[PDB]
Amino acid sequence: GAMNSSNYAELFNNDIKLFVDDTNVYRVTVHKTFEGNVATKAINGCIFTLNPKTGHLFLKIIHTSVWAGQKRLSQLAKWKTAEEVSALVRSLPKEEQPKQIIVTRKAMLDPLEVHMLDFPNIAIRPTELRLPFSAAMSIDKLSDVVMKATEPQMVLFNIYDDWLDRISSYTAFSRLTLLLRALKTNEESAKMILLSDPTITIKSYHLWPSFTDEQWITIESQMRDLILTEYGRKYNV
Amino acid sequence: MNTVPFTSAPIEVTIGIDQYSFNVKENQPFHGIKDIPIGHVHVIHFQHADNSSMRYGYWFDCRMGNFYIQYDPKDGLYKMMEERDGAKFENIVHNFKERQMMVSYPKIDEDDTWYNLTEFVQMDKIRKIVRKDENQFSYVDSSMTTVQENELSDPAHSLNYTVINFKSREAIRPGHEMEDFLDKSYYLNTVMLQGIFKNSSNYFGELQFAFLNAMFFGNYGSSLQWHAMIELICSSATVPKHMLDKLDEILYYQIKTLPEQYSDILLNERVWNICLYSSFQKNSLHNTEKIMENKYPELL
């Protein structure tokens, strides 16, 4: 059924699974109109679909043109998410199709289940984890490809860069969620932490900087601090 | 007017005939039920004094043969039978009526309740839901499961209601996933009405039969089926106007007749609130919404 702390190691077994986060699919800026009314303007979005074991990220970019002339866009966005995830699964060879899809928001369950009626062996699951995947657009290179897109487009990334050469997927996911939590709680501090030192670069083919093992521990500690911090500043503790 | 005579009444039992019921005491001189209105299906049902577990009963139509009840001390229940010999039936029944050992079906002449609950119920269709083809009458009890319930174990003792499942390839057209899940008109009108039921009368008749099995036997799967068939209409943007008008009448009399003390288990809060307040047809069930709100405002 639902996914929580009791079964956190299931993510890193050998059953193919994908997380799907739809929080950045329908994005808007809200503004005043000349008549003093309020209007929205949509901007490009993305479906964040991620294999937590391999780090493979199927970033489906949602171009604003898909909303043209449509009604109830927050609701359409969920079904559009489901449609595009269903399309991805169908494009993958059978031995690459997930055995489970885990949705980060419960409102995605019915839209995805309906789109995947053709795949009755694929389990559609919620989670009780509060995962920070909405902060994916704080990753500069992901944000860049979404905002530059002029048409619908799937871009493939490895959100772990080369980390799996040195650490396990359990540790790689925990780093990723720590980084994304930090970016979500205080993006500027998080980004300052990551890029303060000019001598640690981000390789062209990577998303994150080329930290050594020792540097990652310092970074990880600095991001923990940030998250405990902002939690004070928030709750005055 | 027709008669369901009894051999005797050897065990204390509450007997129901349609929406009426009376207590018969162990070995009381009871020999059946008379003046039963022709033209309607009927149900005669039982709840033993000793074991309130298992309400059970027999759907039947007096036009389809002469029926008598004889308790079976081996199987432990009141069984419906057919007397092949028409002459013996008249001779035994007349004997019983002269000695006044029968209760009279007690219909008030103003009262259309039973008609209104059974308007579209036909014995021929009942027998396709309750498969026991050697008998003209159909047995139902509390514990009988439905075909869909056995998909989620004895196939012969099942209620073969039409399977309705909103998240099914039957209900959802490829490429219309969102359209068809949020507006079930395709499933109601094309799949179910045009495809399976053929007309709204068959649809309504199953719906009414499901309700009556739920109310009379506390048959849980019947209750599920009645609610599903309401929801399938309420969740369709496009429903013929006469079907909605009739549905409002149907439900009105069902809600009117439900025992007040059983509303907590026969009425599904989620379905009713959705149908009355959120669904496409939220404004289309004036009579039903009015009785529901004056009789069971708690549910809403």
Ligand SMILES: O=C(COc1cccc(F)c1)NC1CC1
């Ligand atoms: O028992 C009966 C008939 O029993 C009846 C028939 C008609 C009305 C009635 F009250 C009782 N036939 C053969 C012996 C088994």
